Amino acid sequence: SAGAGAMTIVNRIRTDVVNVAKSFGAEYSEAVIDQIFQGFGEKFTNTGFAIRVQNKRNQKVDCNIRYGEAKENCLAWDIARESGLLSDQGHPVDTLIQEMFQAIPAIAYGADFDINYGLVKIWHLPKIVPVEEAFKIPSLPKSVNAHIDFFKKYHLDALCALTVDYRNKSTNLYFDAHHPEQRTTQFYKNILQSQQFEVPSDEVLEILVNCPEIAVTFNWSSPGIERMCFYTAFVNRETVPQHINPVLKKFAQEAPALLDNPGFLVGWSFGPKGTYIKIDVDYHGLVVPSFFHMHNLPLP
Numbered sequence: 001s002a003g004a005g006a007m008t009i010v011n012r013i014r015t016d017v018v019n020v021a022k023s024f025g026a027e028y029s030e031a032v033i034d035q036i037f038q039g040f041g042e043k044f045t046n047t048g049f050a051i052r053v054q055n056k057r058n059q060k061v062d063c064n065i066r067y068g069e070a071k072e073n074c075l076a077w078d079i080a081r082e083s084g085l086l087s088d089q090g091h092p093v094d095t096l097i098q099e100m101f102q103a104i105p106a107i108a109y110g111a112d113f114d115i116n117y118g119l120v121k122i123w124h125l126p127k128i129v130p131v132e133e134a135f136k137i138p139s140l141p142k143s144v145n146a147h148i149d150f151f152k153k154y155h156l157d158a159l160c161a162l163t164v165d166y167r168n169k170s171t172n173l174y175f176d177a178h179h180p181e182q183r184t185t186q187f188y189k190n191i192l193q194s195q196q197f198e199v200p201s202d203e204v205l206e207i208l209v210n211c212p213e214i215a216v217t218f219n220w221s222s223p224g225i226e227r228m229c230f231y232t233a234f235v236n237r238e239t240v241p242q243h244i245n246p247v248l249k250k251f252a253q254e255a256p257a258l259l260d261n262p263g264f265l266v267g268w269s270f271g272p273k274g275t276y277i278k279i280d281v282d283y284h285g286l287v288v289p290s291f292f293h294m295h296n297l298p299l300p
């Protein structure tokens with residue numbers, strides 16, 4: 001009743017988020033959750049909302065909640081500012097999402113929150129554009145321009161999203177992984193070895209060949225790529241590769257969703273740290289179809 005029986009969608013979401021966190025042992029703050037939901041709870045109920053767990057080595061699972069919607073303006077910024085979730089840090093991140101929306105028209109935006117912290121990222125989603133359109137953005141890390149030849153070499157020509165991480169002080173460029181070389185396990189070996197990142201098992205490599213989206217993370221403190229991530233979606237619980245990792249298995253089987261038959265998005269992250277898995281449940285069933293659609297792929 002307070003947390004069960006008839007209840008608003010938003011209260012159902014809150015309860016489910018806390019349940020996930022408790023089940024996976026993630027930390028959270030009641031004050032932060034409340035602050036997030038006061039500002040964003042209506043968005044979570046009506047748009048493409050997801051709950052994520054991720055499993056960094058030698059630390060607790062983290063639980064994040066996120067959403068995206070097809071609006072051309074960055075509606076999250078005002079909401080986060082007014083909620084007390086986004087204070088200036090005296091840093092390039094402070095104006096970066098604003099610069100992104102000035103430089104490249106968006107067809108959607110989103111935001112992401114760690115329930116033990118607050119707002120972590122805001123996302124900008126344009127139509128797919130040449131990656132060179134990003135070089136207009138004043139406050140991007142210098143490392144981005146320096147990787148022009150790397151992007152060309154690995155067929156990272158088609159930019160499909162941008163994000164600003166206010167917590168980590170980093171930015172990600174996301175690419176539509178359209179090129180047939182990206183359907184080969186050798187591509188993933190090569191791109192990882194180019195950054196001296198560890199190469200995963202053959203089993204994981206055979207999963208990566210279906211990845212429609214590649215993120216690359218840059219920061220202002222170093223000249224190199226901080227980490228990269230390969231995203232793969234699965235249309236239901238059973239098709240998630242549960243045997244690869246116990247968090248994948250548990251989350252596919254037990255993650256809550258309002259829709260009876262949800263899909264999932266899995267991010268395989270690699271770094272030098274940086275190597276872990278992220279898994280999101282498609283809580284209302286809107287995210288996975290949208291993901292395939294944004295990458296010009298038929299729905300599997």
Ligand code: DMA
Binds near residue numbers: 121163172215265
């Ligand atoms: C496909 C998709 C929804 C990507 C969002 O970026 P992310 O949350 O995985 O970024 P990061 O984990 O680098 O903060």
